[model samples]
Target: TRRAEVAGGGFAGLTAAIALKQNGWDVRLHEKSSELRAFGAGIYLWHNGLRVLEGLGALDDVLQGSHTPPTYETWMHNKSVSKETFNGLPWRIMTRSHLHDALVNRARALGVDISVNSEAVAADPVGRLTLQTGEVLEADLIVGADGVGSKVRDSIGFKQDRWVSKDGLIRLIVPRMKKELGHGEWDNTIDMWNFWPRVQRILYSPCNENELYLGLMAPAADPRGSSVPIDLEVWVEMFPFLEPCLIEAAKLKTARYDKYETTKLDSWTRGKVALVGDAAHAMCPALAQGAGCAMVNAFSLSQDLEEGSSVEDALVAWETRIRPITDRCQALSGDYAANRSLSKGNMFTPAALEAARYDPLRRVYSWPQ
Candidate 1:
């Protein structure tokens, strides 16, 4: 029987575990945390990731608390720049936990053995995962789905270039008070930009009916722009229309100011170990496809595992076919920070295009063909 061990418990790790189990591999997953949980921020799901969820038979549940905004609008200097639909593609915005819980439920239903608090400290190219307790487990395949600072990637000696953007973002989730949001189109996902007085952007996204996701973007050096309590006076002065929402945002207990990050790897695999998600390609939120690319690749990685092929061969084929898509997303997302002309649609269009063209419903290794 085939065996696979996965590191990390985030989107990529869970998806990879489920996909491998679906493809007939015995899978075990380890997460560093005491319990599985997602951050407070909301996430964007393009059709690419949505299709993978559908393939895993978790889309229905994942979409339960998600919201599909009527339009995606951008505003600059208190005026509208562009308001566009999703070009007939399927997408949804949901709290990070909404998606995480759905994936965890499916993984549990599929009989995946999840070990929380089992942190992987290192990995060998020969299908070995070393835990912090000093126990080493061997398997037919090892997956490093861990985040940007992946120990597996480094332990295996894969050269990488991790880039950090000059700008950072503070994410907060506030109650969605439709009545108090008296002005502006509350039904749409809005990106409000302020450039002259201070380089700032407030991304207003509705996760579900009861909650709203606010992503505050600012330069790294601007202490006033990246504060947790959120410089209410400064923010209110820039976009007074959001005073009601900003006031609620200030009430949050805590928040994180994360700079956009991208990880470029020379190779995604060595020997029997392969990398997935942020471990392989960690892109900035500029494209919102960071998780999308991660899910798509994790699903594809399992499909590439054929019955008769060697694990090394399968890893090479998977990376060759899928790395280009992720690389494009990382480059475009990174460029978006410096160049403002790239529309929000432009950043994730590659993912949408791939989902449209390569429908995952069609099996890569169909039998008796």
Candidate 2:
């Protein structure tokens, strides 16, 4: 069996580890943290990403802990804009840990070697990883699934551009408070927009039976809007109907705050090393495909490798086949802030939906059929 070493234990790396092991590669996954974890509150999973999990046998666990909403609603200026039911592929929402734990469990069950607190400080095109602990590991393939500030990607000397946008988001998971939201509201995921309140937006969805995810979006310059322990009075004024949930959001002990970012690499592979996930392309959340794309690319890399005559050839072909649509998704997400609107038929513009629809299995791309 060929040997593979994957850095970063996030969704991308874990997915790669699972898929590589299934594809006849002896895989070892390295995580810099003390333990495997998912940082955010909730995540949106469309068909494309879910299919990858299904192939890896983690989908059942994910579905068990996730909530599949019947409808996606959009509201603006205290008025209903649209309420559309999911049409094509399934759209499931869950706590980040819900998805992360499923992947971790699946990887362990498959016997993929997982080492936490084993940080890779650098990697070379020759498939060598230098650890922060001063240990050097070599394998037939080195996968850099590390995050936005990827040390492996930098060490490989790939030229790239990273941009931090003017807007950012704060994520919190509050009590579900089902009775407070009543029936209809509790069953649907909502996207609320407030242009008058300086472009503040809220993504409200139930991740599980007991928890609701709230993603507050605002300009990075607005300290009051983006900070945790969110400004309750201000949000309440704009979204009075959701004051109860807002109250719970205000009590959140801590929240994950992130500035919208985009990372573009000239090439995803060099020699025996390949980059996936945020290490390759980190896009804005306007399309909600950052993690989805990451999983797709990593899984696709493994599939491509299984069919190739050589490792380098497989990496090149994999990047060539995947980078086009991934780049399109990134570009469209970057343009969404100016073009976004709540409409009756779709949560995002049709173009954005199409980009999020990229499927690695069929190689064609819904949210697969």
Whole-model alpha-carbon lDDT for candidate 2: 0.85
Model 1 C-alpha lDDT versus the unseen true structure: 0.83
Cα lDDT tens digits, model 2, 289-348, are: 999999999999988998856899999999998888789888877776557634223655
Clashes of each: 0, 1
Off by over 4 Å in 2: 341-350, 366-369
Write down the TM-score for model 1.
Answer: 0.93
Kindly report which residue pairs in candidate 2 clash with one another.
47-367
The whole-model lDDT of each prediction reads 0.83, 0.85
Structural similarity to truth (TM-score) of each candidate:
0.93, 0.95
Which candidate tops lDDT?
Answer: 2
Please report how far candidate 1 places residue 136 from its true position, in Å: 1.0
Q: Poorest 10 consecutive residues of model 1 by lDDT?
A: 360-369
